[PDB]
Amino acid sequence: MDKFRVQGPTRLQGEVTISGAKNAALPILFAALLAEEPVEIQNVPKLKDIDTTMKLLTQLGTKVERXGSVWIDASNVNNFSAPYDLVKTMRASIWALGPLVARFGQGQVSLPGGCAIGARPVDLHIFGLEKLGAEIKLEEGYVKASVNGRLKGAHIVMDKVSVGATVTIMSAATLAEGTTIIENAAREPEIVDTANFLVALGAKISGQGTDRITIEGVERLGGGVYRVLPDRIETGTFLVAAAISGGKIVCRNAQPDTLDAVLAKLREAGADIETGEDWISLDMHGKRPKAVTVRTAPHPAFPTDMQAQFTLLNLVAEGTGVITETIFENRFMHVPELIRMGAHAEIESNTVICHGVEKLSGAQVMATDLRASASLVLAGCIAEGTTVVDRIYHIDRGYERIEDKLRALGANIERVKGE
Numbered sequence: 398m399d400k401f402r403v404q405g406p407t408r409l410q411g412e413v414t415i416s417g418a419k420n421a422a423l424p425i426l427f428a429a430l431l432a433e434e435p436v437e438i439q440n441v442p443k444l445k446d447i448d449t450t451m452k453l454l455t456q457l458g459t460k461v462e463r464x465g466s467v468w469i470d471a472s473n474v475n476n477f478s479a480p481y482d483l484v485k486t487m488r489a490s491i492w493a494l495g496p497l498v499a500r501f502g503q504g505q506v507s508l509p510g511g512c513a514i515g516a517r518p519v520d521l522h523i524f525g526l527e528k529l530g531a532e533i534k535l536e537e538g539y540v541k542a543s544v545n546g547r548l549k550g551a552h553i554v555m556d557k558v559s560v561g562a563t564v565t566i567m568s569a570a571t572l573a574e575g576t577t578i579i580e581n582a583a584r585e586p587e588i589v590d591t592a593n594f595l596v597a598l599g600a601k602i603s604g605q606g607t608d609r610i611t612i613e614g615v616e617r618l619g620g621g622v623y624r625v626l627p628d629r630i631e632t633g634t635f636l637v638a639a640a641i642s643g644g645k646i647v648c649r650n651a652q653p654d655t656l657d658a659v660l661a662k663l664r665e666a667g668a669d670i671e672t673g674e675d676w677i678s679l680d681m682h683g684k685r686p687k688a689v690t691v692r693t694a695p696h697p698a699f700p701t702d703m704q705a706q707f708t709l710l711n712l713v714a715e716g717t718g719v720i721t722e723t724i725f726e727n728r729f730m731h732v733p734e735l736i737r738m739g740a741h742a743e744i745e746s747n748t749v750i751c752h753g754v755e756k757l758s759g760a761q762v763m764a765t766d767l768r769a770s771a772s773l774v775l776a777g778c779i780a781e782g783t784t785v786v787d788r789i790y791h792i793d794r795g796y797e798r799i800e801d802k803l804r805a806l807g808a809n810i811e812r813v814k815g816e
C-alpha cells in the first residue's frame with residue numbers, strides 16, 4: 398500500500414509545469430467518438446482514468462495510441478457497447494452513450510447496479526438523450542439508446558445542474574438535426590473546453606460557460622489537433638504549496654482565467670502574484686500567509702475543490718480565518734488529521750474556524766479525498782520531522798506524479814511501502 402514519506406520543514410520554491418486537466422481530457426476523449434477524421438489530443442495527463450478510457454475506446458473499434466498526446470482514429474467504430482468489465486471502475490464511462498447513438502444510431506453502456514442501493518444516478522444522461530429523440534431501453538445494470546437516423550434538436554431545461562449530463566447532451570446535439578438549447582447548463586471551465594474541442598471539429602456551439610448553451614446540429618465532425626486546458630485545481634495546489642512555505646513559484650502551462658477567485662483569495666493572504674497568458678507566479682517574499690475568509694460557491698466563485706488547500710493555508714497563517722462550504726456538507730473530515738499535526742481549529746456546521754500556528758508536527762495521517770490527501774502531503778512538507786501520508790493512490794488518480802513535482806520544488810519526499 399503506497400505511502401508518502403515526507404521530511405520537513407522545507408521551503409517549496411521554483412517551477413512546476415501544470416498537467417492537462419483530467420476532467421476536460423475525459424469528456425474530450427469520449428467526444429472524439431464523433432470524429433470521422435484522426436485527432437491529436439495534446440496535453441493529456443498520464444492517469445488511471447485515461448488508461449481506462451483508452452481501453453474502452455479500443456474496445457469500441459477506435460484506433461488509439463499515446464505518449465504527451467493521445468492519438469485517436471474513430472473513423473471505424475464497429476462495436477457499440479461498453480461492457481461491465483471495462484466500465485466497472487469508471488463512472489465517466491457513461492460519456493460513450495451520447496456519441497454512439499448520435500453518430501451511429503445506437504449505443505449501450507453497462508451500469509453496475511444503477512438499480513443497486515446507493516448507485517449513482519444517470520437519469521439526466523438518459524432523459525437528456527430521450528429529449529433528443531433517442532429511444533431508450535432500460536434493464537437493471539444497463540442502458541441502451543437508439544434512433545432511426547439523426548437525433549433531433551430540442552429545448553432542454555435542466556432541473557438539476559450537471560457537469561456530466563451537460564457533456565452528454567451537448568456532445569450528442571452536435572450531430573442532431575436543428576438547434577438544441579440547454580438551460581441551466583454546468584458552467585465549469587471543463588465544459589467550455591469540451592465545447593471548444595467540439596467547435597474545433599466543426600460543431601456549432603455558443604454560450605459555453607454561461608447558464609445557456611446553444612447547439613446547432615451539423616453534418617459531421619472532422620479531425621485535427623486539440624490542446625486540453627491546464628489543470629486548474631492542480632495549479633491551485635502548487636500555488637498554495639508556495640504560499641504556505643514562504644516560497645516563490647512559477648506555474649508553467651497554466652491558464653490564469655480559470656482561477657479568478659483563487660488568485661484574488663491568495664492576494665488576500667498577502668501573496669505577490671503575477672500572470673501571463675500561459676503562466677502564473679506566486680511570491681511570499683519569505684513571509685507567513687495572512688488568514689483569510691473563504692466562501693466556496695458554484696463556478697466562477699471560489700471552488701470547493703480548493704477548500705482543503707486553503708484550510709491548510711489558514712492553519713499556518715497569521716491570525717484567525719473561517720472557511721465556509723455553502724453548498725456541500727461534510728467537507729471537513731480531514732481537519733482532525735491536521736489537528737493531530739498541531740493545528741488549531743474548530744469545525745462548526747458547514748464551517749471550520751482556523752487559528753494559525755507557527756509550525757506543524759510530523760505524524761501518520763490519511764484522507765480518502767484527493768484534495769484533502771494532497772493537503773496532507775503539503776502539510777508534511779512544512780511540518781517539523783517525519784510525516785507519513787497513507788493510501789496515496791487517491792492522489793495518484795488525480796495528480797500526475799506529484800512526488801516528482803514536489804521534489805523539484807525542494808521537498809524531501811519518498812514513495813514508500815509499509816505493510
Ligand SMILES: O=c1ccn([C@@H]2O[C@H](COP(=O)(O)OP(=O)(O)OP(=O)(O)O)[C@@H](O)[C@H]2O)c(=O)[nH]1
Pocket residue numbers: 488517518519520521522523557558559560561562583
Ligand atoms: O444523471 C445524473 C447525473 C448527475 N446527477 C447528480 O447531479 C449532481 C451533480 O452532477 P455532476 O455531473 O456535476 O456531478 P458528478 O458527475 O461528479 O456526480 P456523481 O458522480 O456523484 O453522480 C450529483 O450530485 C449527481 O448525483 C443526477 O442525479 N443524475
